[PDB]
Structures are given as C-alpha cells and as structure tokens.
Design a binder for this molecule. Structure first.
Ligand SMILES: [Cl-]
Ligand SMILES: [Co+2]
Ligand SMILES: [Co+2]
Ligand SMILES: [Co+2]
Length: 220
C-alpha cells in the first residue's frame, strides 16, 4: 500500500441487507432494504459509495450469493466509467466470495490484480454514521456518491497514519458504537464540519483518541 499503484479495497458486506420481523402468526418475514458497496482508496481517502436500491433484487432469489456478483458488476462498471489513468492496479477484498465474481467481471482488465485479505476493515460501521446511514436508507434509486474519508488529515499526516486512524475509528464503532462516539467527542464544543465525516480535533486530542479506540477494540 501507499506507492504509485492505485489500490482499492472493496467491501460487499452491506450490499444485501434485510429487516426480519416475527409476525403475529409466528413466522419470520424478511424484507430487503437498501444497501451499499464501499470502494476505498487508502492512499487518498477517496470513497466511492454505490447505493444499491432494493429494486435490483426484483424477480431474483439467493440474494446473498447474487450480491457478490452485483458487487463485481458495479466495480467493473465504475472502472469502465473512469479514464485508464484513474483505474486501479490492485483490488483487495476482505470477503473470499468476491474473488471469482471479480475475476470473471474483470477479464477485459488484464492490468488489474485481484487479491484477498484478512484485514478487519468494517465499513458496515459507516451505516452507524448518520451521513451515510440516512443517505442509504432514503435512496429511491441507485446512485454513486463520492466522499473523502480523511477530511483534512493529509495536510499534516501521512496516508499510512490516516489509514491507521480510519481503521481504528471504524473498528471501534463496530465493536462499541456508543463508547466510540463518546471517545470521538472529547469536549462539549467538539464538532464535525458539514463537509467532513469526522470531528475537528487537535493533534494531542487525536493521540489520545487513537489510544482509547485501540483499547476499546482490545476489550471487545
Ligand atoms: Cl504513507
Ligand atoms: Co446490470
Ligand atoms: Co483475471
Ligand atoms: Co475539509
């Protein structure tokens, strides 16, 4: 990571989402709700968020499996919409079920290396950040939305440091959302800018936050 090669992490976790309800008759109803693909460049902080509207499942079955293919389809479609100089050199997936669908969808892109990973990068935690969660919930059609998940961090820290910070935030939100949100608000006056994802904190504040988030993850 972090060299001249454009790298994307792709997360399919959140593509097929449902609500499950027990009926008065005692059976379970499962209803799809909107999902999202997260495509993330760890050097620059760029996120492509591809909102998956429930209409894409119309007429279909085995939706959890089909979601792997839909993810690969949408990654390929994004790549074909980009100039060659913006296309990734490497795609990294933390779900093994993505490898074969990507391979078949990307046959026309021989430069692109696909690999698996055991890294813990839980973008599902973003569904807990209201900016993302409501946007996904309320969508009435597919769409793609761009974000910068590093805010203004790269003005003063490296991509390596930024990536590490982001991962600690996401993992902490995943393990204990309520406590992570408290750690991320060290003062009554702590705020997040409207165009930012994360709070505006001092260097000293981030140092403490990062240690606290790490400790929260360790405590599970
Ligand atoms: Cl770096
Ligand atoms: Co299609
Ligand atoms: Co291939
Ligand atoms: Co900014």
């Amino acid at each position: 990571l972090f060299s001249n090669q454009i790298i994307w992490f792709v997360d399919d976790t959140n593509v097929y989402r449902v609500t499950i309800h027990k009926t008065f008759e005692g059976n379970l109803t499962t209803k799809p709700i909107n999902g999202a693909i997260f495509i993330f460049n760890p050097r620059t902080g760029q996120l492509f968020l591809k909102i998956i509207h429930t209409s894409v499942w119309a007429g279909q079955k085995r939706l959890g499996q089909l979601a792997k293919w839909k993810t690969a389809e949408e990654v390929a479609a994004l790549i074909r919409s980009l100039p060659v100089e913006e296309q990734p050199k490497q795609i990294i997936v933390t779900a093994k079920g993505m490898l074969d669908p990507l391979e078949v969808h990307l046959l026309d892109f021989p430069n692109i290396v696909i690999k698996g990973s055991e890294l813990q990068l839980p973008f599902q935690a973003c569904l807990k950040v209201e900016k993302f969660g409501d946007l996904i919930l309320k969508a009435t059609e597919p769409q793609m939305v761009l974000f910068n998940l590093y805010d203004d961090w790269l003005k003063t820290i490296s991509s390596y440091t930024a990536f590490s910070r982001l991962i600690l935030i996401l993992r902490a939100l995943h393990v204990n959302n309520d406590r992570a949100k408290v750690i991320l608000k060290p003062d009554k006056t702590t705020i997040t800018e409207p165009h930012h994802i994360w709070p505006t904190l001092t260097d000293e504040e981030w140092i403490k936050v990062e240690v606290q988030l790490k400790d929260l993850i360790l405590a599970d």
